[PDB]
Design an enzyme around this catalytic site. Structure first.
Site, PDB file in Angstrom:
ATOM      1  N   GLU A  83       4.478  10.608  -0.260  1.00 35.73           N
ATOM      2  CA  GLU A  83       4.171   9.155  -0.455  1.00 35.73           C
ATOM      3  C   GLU A  83       5.204   8.002  -0.039  1.00 35.73           C
ATOM      4  OE1 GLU A  83       2.721   8.275  -4.389  1.00 35.73           O
ATOM      5  OE2 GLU A  83       4.677   8.641  -5.381  1.00 35.73           O
ATOM      6  N   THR A 110       0.738  -1.161   0.188  1.00 40.52           N
ATOM      7  CA  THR A 110       0.127   0.136  -0.189  1.00 40.52           C
ATOM      8  C   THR A 110       0.905   1.286  -0.051  1.00 40.52           C
ATOM      9  OG1 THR A 110      -1.746   1.052   0.960  1.00 40.52           O
ATOM     10  CG2 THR A 110      -0.348   0.210   2.397  1.00 40.52           C
ATOM     11  N   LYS A 111       0.160   2.508  -0.544  1.00 34.97           N
ATOM     12  CA  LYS A 111       0.946   3.594  -0.391  1.00 34.97           C
ATOM     13  C   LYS A 111       0.295   4.591   0.707  1.00 34.97           C
ATOM     14  CE  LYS A 111      -0.860   6.565  -3.069  1.00 34.97           C
ATOM     15  NZ  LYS A 111      -0.950   7.539  -4.561  1.00 34.97           N
ATOM     16  N   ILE A 112       1.033   5.176   1.531  1.00 36.13           N
ATOM     17  CA  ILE A 112       0.673   5.975   2.690  1.00 36.13           C
ATOM     18  C   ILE A 112       1.279   7.317   2.539  1.00 36.13           C
ATOM     19  CG2 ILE A 112       0.571   6.073   5.200  1.00 36.13           C
ATOM     20  CD1 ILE A 112       0.630   3.343   5.414  1.00 36.13           C
TER      21      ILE A 112
END
Lengths: 123, 81
Positions: B40, B4-6
């Site tokens: 990101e 995932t990208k946070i």
RNA sequence: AUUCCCACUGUCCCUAUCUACUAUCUAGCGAGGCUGUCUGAUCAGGCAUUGCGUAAGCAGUAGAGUAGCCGUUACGAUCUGCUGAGA
């Protein structure tokens, strides 16, 4: 698995004690490694000195060339020899012992270097 | 494996903690394709534990993001007790 | 090297004030307090590119302590009064 508040507080509130603990462990490991390499350096030095001393001796060698006695009165006398000069025993024992002994990186290196320079010159 | 990208922010460590709870190894990175100026970060998680009885309260946002407990003094802009 | 958290800031909202230096013309030529230090000490002042509201003096038997005896010399920071005084 379960969701527990204590674990999340321990993880979030930290991030600083863990880093200093790791730094302390690394520092003490470095100190231990330094003391080791020092003692093996001492070993090398002592061996060199012993070897040169033995070679000097070798090359100079070539250039060189309780009793008990009973009487008639039932009285016994005990006679034991004594050694005032203890050096004889020490040299004899030295001679006897001498006789006994004898990491992963993303891009290409070139591309990585170009990217690093392009990031560096901006600042 | 969950990738995932946070967006890095004050609520970035809680997601990492939850991922560690559900995954055996959780690790973040920033691939060179993503621009450096962007905030990101791509975090992957491998080794799903797959619990038999997962805690629904663990995946509920209402308490995942629970706020941490707490001369010209600093401007009081943190609310009140 | 990059990105997020907290704190700070004239970077900005949004500029304002002061000092130094500069620029101009003329004669000639001409392309109250504090730190450091010094006046022997107080008092009063100088310097360190503003360096960074109760005067001087006297008195008290009150006063940390220094200095005389087993009721008592002397010195004495600080405090109180003359004193919303002094400038």
């Amino acid at each position: 698995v379960t969701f527990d508040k204590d674990s999340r507080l321990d993880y979030l509130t930290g991030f600083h004690k863990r880093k200093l603990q790791r730094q302390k462990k690394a520092q003490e490991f470095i100190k231990e490694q330094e003391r080791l390499r020092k003692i093996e350096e001492r070993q090398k030095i002592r061996q060199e000195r012993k070897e040169v001393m033995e070679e000097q001796l070798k090359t100079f060698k070539e250039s060189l060339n309780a009793i008990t006695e009973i009487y008639d009165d039932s009285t016994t006398v005990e006679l034991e020899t004594l050694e005032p000069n203890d050096n004889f025993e020490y040299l004899a024992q030295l001679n006897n012992v001498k006789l006994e002994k004898a990491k992963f990186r993303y891009l290409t290196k070139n591309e990585r270097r170009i990217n690093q320079r392009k990031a560096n010159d901006n600042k | 494996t969950f990738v995932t990208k946070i967006f890095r922010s004050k609520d970035y460590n809680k997601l990492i903690w939850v991922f560690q709870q559900l995954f055996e190894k959780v690790e973040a990175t920033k691939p060179p394709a993503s621009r450096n100026v962007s905030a990101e970060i791509f975090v992957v998680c491998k080794g799903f534990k797959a619990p038999k009885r997962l805690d629904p309260r663990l995946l509920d946002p209402k308490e995942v993001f629970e706020e941490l407990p707490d001369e010209k003094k600093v401007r009081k802009r943190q609310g009140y007790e």
